């Protein structure tokens, strides 16, 4: 039994059913939305810091922590030892993934660049896991439609996101950039960075003078590290205390629309006036993750 799907490398044929899966580099919250944690035998170690992973994975001790590095060679010997039927992986190094795929194990490989693409890739995974994701994907889209409707006619705020260091930002073909855009941010990184995330000189950041700055949830930087950086003292975002760390939500996953909502609410609070934000957040978690009221509580905002 099999199913044909498409990924980064073209058509793939997935043998069914899938018993053991590994998540490398992205999509760590997918098992949470599908209730398939029992099928997971390995996951990139960043995942254990996600709050929906912490809450929904009952036996984290069972799952082998894997590398969260996208560039170095994949650990093919560990992959073979865990005997997965399927490895879902983020392609940060096409050649290294291709190299990895030459060892007898099926890969489903993605490089999600937009929230729209995230949802397509989630649906592809749902085919491999033989789950019906339609209602959950629809909730994701309803939420995107809602944000867009509130931001209609609102002038975007000039901003940028910082990554592991204070001069690494995102540009074209970066899911972070799409998430910023859907949050109502004019990301100046598009002007400087031609693909993914890359460095820029601090003097260009100062010249661009962003009104708001976000920090990648995996970054070691705190908002204070940025606020107190002498290099940034003349920047509007610093002077006006508009520096925010993004929530503990994996970008390539079922909560991407909530990250854009978070950004929109920070950037354009006036756009969300007669909106019951926590009702929206509550129903998002109930539908997407099947949480009950008590379980939803720590995920509500403020």
Ligand X SMILES: N[C@@H](Cc1c[nH]c[nH+]1)C(=O)O
* Between 252 and 268, CB nearer to ligand X: 252
Residue from the set 25, 159, 171, 184 that interacts with ligand X by CB under 6 A: 25
168 binds ligand X (CB under 6 A): no
247 binds ligand X (CB under 6 A): no
Least distance CB 194 / ligand X (angstroms): 11
* Between 42 and 252, CB nearer to ligand X: 252
* Between 196 and 247, CB nearer to ligand X: 196
Residue from the set 30, 126, 174, 238 that interacts with ligand X by CB under 6 A: 174
245 binds ligand X (CB under 6 A): no
Q: Of residues 54-83, which lie at the interface with ligand X (CB under 6 A)?
A: 68, 70
Least distance CB 225 / ligand X (angstroms): 18
Distance CA 221, CA 272 (A): 28
Query: In the bound complex, which residue of the shown chain has the CB atom lying closest to ligand X?
Result: 196
Least distance CB 175 / ligand X (angstroms): 7
Backbone torsion region of residue 295, taken as left when φ is above 0, otherwise alpha when ψ lies between -120 and 50, otherwise beta:
alpha
Closest among 56, 47, 7 to 23, alpha carbons compared: 47
Q: Name beta bridge partners: 65.
A: 43
Residue from the set 196, 225, 277, 287 that interacts with ligand X by CB under 6 A: 196
Residue from the set 202, 218, 277, 280 that interacts with ligand X by CB under 6 A: 218
* Between 46 and 299, CB nearer to ligand X: 46
* Between 32 and 251, CB nearer to ligand X: 251
Least distance CB 8 / ligand X (angstroms): 11
34 binds ligand X (CB under 6 A): no
> Tokens representing 82?
């865990």
Least distance CB 282 / ligand X (angstroms): 25
221 binds ligand X (CB under 6 A): no
Distances, alpha carbon 11 to alpha carbons 4, 7, 14, 108, 109, in Å: 7, 6, 10, 10, 11
Least distance CB 216 / ligand X (angstroms): 6
Residue from the set 90, 110, 232, 244 that interacts with ligand X by CB under 6 A: 90
Chain contacts with ligand X (rule: CB under 6 A): 25-26, 46, 68, 70, 90, 92, 174, 196-197, 218, 251-252
């Amino acid at each position: 039994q099999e199913v044909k799907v498409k990924d980064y490398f073209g058509e793939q044929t997935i043998k069914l059913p899938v018993s053991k899966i590994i998540y490398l580099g992205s999509f760590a919250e997918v098992p949470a939305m599908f209730h398939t944690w029992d099928r997971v035998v390995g996951i990139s170690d960043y995942a254990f810091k996600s709050d929906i992973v912490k809450a929904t994975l009952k036996d984290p001790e069972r799952i082998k922590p894997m590398s969260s590095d996208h560039v170095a060679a994949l650990n093919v010997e560990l992959l073979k030892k865990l005997s997965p039927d399927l490895v879902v992986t983020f392609v940060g190094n096409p050649k290294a993934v291709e190299h990895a795929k030459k060892f007898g194990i099926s890969f489903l490989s993605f490089q999600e660049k937009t929230i729209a693409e995230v949802m397509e890739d989630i649906d592809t995974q749902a085919k491999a896991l033989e789950v019906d994701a339609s209602k959950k994907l629809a909730k994701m889209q309803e939420t995107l439609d809602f944000i867009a409707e509130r931001l209609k006619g609102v002038k975007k705020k000039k901003g940028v996101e910082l990554f592991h260091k204070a001069n690494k930002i995102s540009g074209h073909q970066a899911l972070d950039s799409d998430i910023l855009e859907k949050g109502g941010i004019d990301n100046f990184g598009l002007k400087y960075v031609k693909f993914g995330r890359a460095d820029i000189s601090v003097e260009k950041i100062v010249k661009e003078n962003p009104e708001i700055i976000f920090i990648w949830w995996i970054s070691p930087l705190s908002p204070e590290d940025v606020l107190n950086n002498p290099k940034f003292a003349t920047i509007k975002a610093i002077k006006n205390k508009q520096v925010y760390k993004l929530p503990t939500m994996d970008i390539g996953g079922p909560r991407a629309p909530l990250i854009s909502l978070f950004i929109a609410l920070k950037a354009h609070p006036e756009a969300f006036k007669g909106v019951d934000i926590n009702a929206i957040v509550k129903d998002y978690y109930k539908v997407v993750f099947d949480l009950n009221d008590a379980e939803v509580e720590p995920f509500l905002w403020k």
